[PDB]
């Protein structure tokens, strides 16, 4: 019983991650005035490089789906024609069911991330005795990573520049009602919820 409003980026030359991140920031601004976790991300044109020009907001209700797509940002990028919002059409039966998963394992591979991890492990080694050597914690020599298309997100309450980094993968077309999260989802601590693309 899922509907979709795909917003395509028209202006012919633009960064897609810079828009996708902003779209998820405004989704994240919502779901706090209306404490809900119902709405997905649905990147339909996710290729290996430059995630495609449009993003939908697949959900069940279709009353919140269109509540959040009128929040004076999506509307303000409509008169100046950089967005093209759809008319909330239903998902067909036999679709491709993908899953956009925030990993967060990639954030703790960065040298800062490793340092942060070792510093925490140093703090909660208060199971006291040997002050374990930070000498015996070396980055291996080589890490083969894929694929994770990192989006330029940032914190509101603190002025910190983070980076949610998200992976596409497709199987098992049914679980939950819905589940999702703050920034849309296919991971958060409970679910591997698919998305009908």
């Amino acid at each position: 019983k899922w509907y979709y409003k795909t917003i395509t980026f028209l202006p012919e030359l633009c960064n897609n991650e810079s828009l996708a991140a902003k779209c998820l920031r405004v989704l994240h601004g919502f779901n706090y005035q209306y404490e809900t976790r119902n709405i997905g991300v649905s990147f339909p044109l996710w290729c290996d490089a430059t995630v495609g020009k449009k993003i939908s907001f697949v959900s069940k209700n279709k009353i919140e789906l269109d509540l959040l797509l009128k929040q004076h940002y999506f509307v303000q990028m409509e008169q100046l024609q950089y967005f093209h919002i759809s008319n909330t059409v239903l998902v067909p039966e036999d679709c491709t069911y993908v899953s956009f998963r925030r990993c967060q394992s990639i954030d703790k591979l960065t040298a800062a991330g490793l340092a942060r991890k070792i510093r925490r492990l140093e703090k909660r080694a208060l199971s006291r005795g040997e002050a374990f050597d930070p000498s015996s914690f070396a980055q291996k020599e080589h890490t083969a990573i894929a694929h994770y298309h990192s989006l330029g997100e940032s914190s509101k309450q603190t002025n910190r520049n983070f980076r949610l980094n998200i992976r596409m993968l497709s199987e098992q077309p049914r679980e939950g009602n819905s589940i999702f999260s703050s920034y849309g989802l296919a991971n958060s601590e409970n679910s591997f919820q698919p998305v009908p693309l």
Binding site: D48, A115, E141, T143, A146
Partner: protein
């Protein structure tokens, strides 16, 4: 002029700059780095080198040798220009001594110019020379930001005169030699970037590495650390900053070059007036206007020096 077969051999000989992580237990390990590759879904390697958590500081060690290959050409081919160039060197040596170039070369070794970027966002960095041949204590330069800023800060008479002389005698004497073993200590902020030398790879950020105790470590080049010591050339027409000594005064950062053959200040325009510079270095007085500053540049090129032939 330019006798179709004329080469010089370099008089300064630096080595690779080996990095060590020294720990709060004053034990030292070879600094190692991470090499990430993004396995693009159904070549583009990137390297990251930081100071590991809970490390005391970094130790950077290398050696440099000042020798006497600038007195006579390696190959010359011509028993006319050989004695011309040997006369020009010894007339320089007698009239305007090795003090200026010796000081200029030695300052870059004593202020950590050869660290390039690693001194940026650093608290304290000290340099210790072990000179040879030498009878006494190691030459020390403590935190080189506060109390070693200008020439006069170095001329603290404790050792400076004892190590400038021995570079003058290296360039003066036949089979003259001075060997400095340079060790720098870098007190960086927690988890700070180390910036070593990068491999060419003709077409992102693959580092130049060596093996120490069976683990790979970044090295910050050999010819890299020679380019740093030879950044003494600020005699080019007007002046802004010191260039690395070349023939056509090349700036790398912006891809122009000063000392262009049009200006008549490149090495080949100045060299082809050797016969002129012989007579002006005989009579009193040589001006420090363009003539001394050209002799400095000509010598600077001969302390370097490949093949000046056509």
């Amino acid at each position: 002029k330019l006798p179709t077969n004329l080469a010089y051999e370099r008089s300064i000989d630096p080595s690779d700059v080996c990095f060590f992580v020294v720990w709060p237990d004053d034990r030292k390990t070879p600094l190692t780095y991470n090499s990430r590759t993004l396995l693009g879904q159904m070549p583009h390697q990137v390297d990251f080198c930081h100071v590991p958590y809970g490390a005391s500081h970094i130790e950077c060690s290398f050696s440099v040798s000042f020798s006497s290959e600038l007195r006579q050409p390696y190959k010359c081919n011509s028993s006319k220009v050989k004695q011309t160039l040997v006369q020009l060197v010894e007339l320089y040596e007698t009239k305007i001594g090795w003090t200026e170039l010796a000081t200029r070369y030695l300052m870059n070794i004593c202020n950590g110019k050869w660290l390039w970027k690693n001194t940026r966002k650093a608290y304290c960095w000290n340099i210790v020379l072990t000179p040879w041949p030498w009878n006494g204590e190691k030459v020390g330069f403590e935190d080189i930001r506060t109390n070693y800023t200008s020439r006069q800060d170095f001329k603290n008479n404790k050792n400076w005169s004892a190590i400038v002389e021995m570079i003058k005698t290296a360039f003066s004497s036949t089979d003259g030699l001075a060997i400095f073993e340079v060790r720098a200590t870098l007190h960086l902020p927690t988890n700070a970037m180390v910036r070593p030398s990068q491999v060419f790879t003709e077409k992102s950020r693959v580092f130049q590495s060596t093996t120490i105790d069976g683990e790979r470590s970044p090295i910050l080049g050999a010819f890299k650390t020679g380019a740093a010591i030879a950044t003494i050339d600020d005699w080019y027409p007007e002046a802004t900053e010191p260039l690395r000594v070349g023939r056509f005064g090349v700036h790398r950062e912006d891809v122009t070059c000063y000392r262009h053959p049009s200006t008549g200040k490149d090495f080949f325009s100045i060299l082809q007036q050797a016969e002129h510079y012989i007579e002006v270095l005989s009579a009193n007085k040589t001006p420090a206007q363009e003539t001394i500053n050209d002799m400095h540049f000509l010598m600077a090129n001969l302390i370097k020096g490949g093949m000046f032939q056509h």
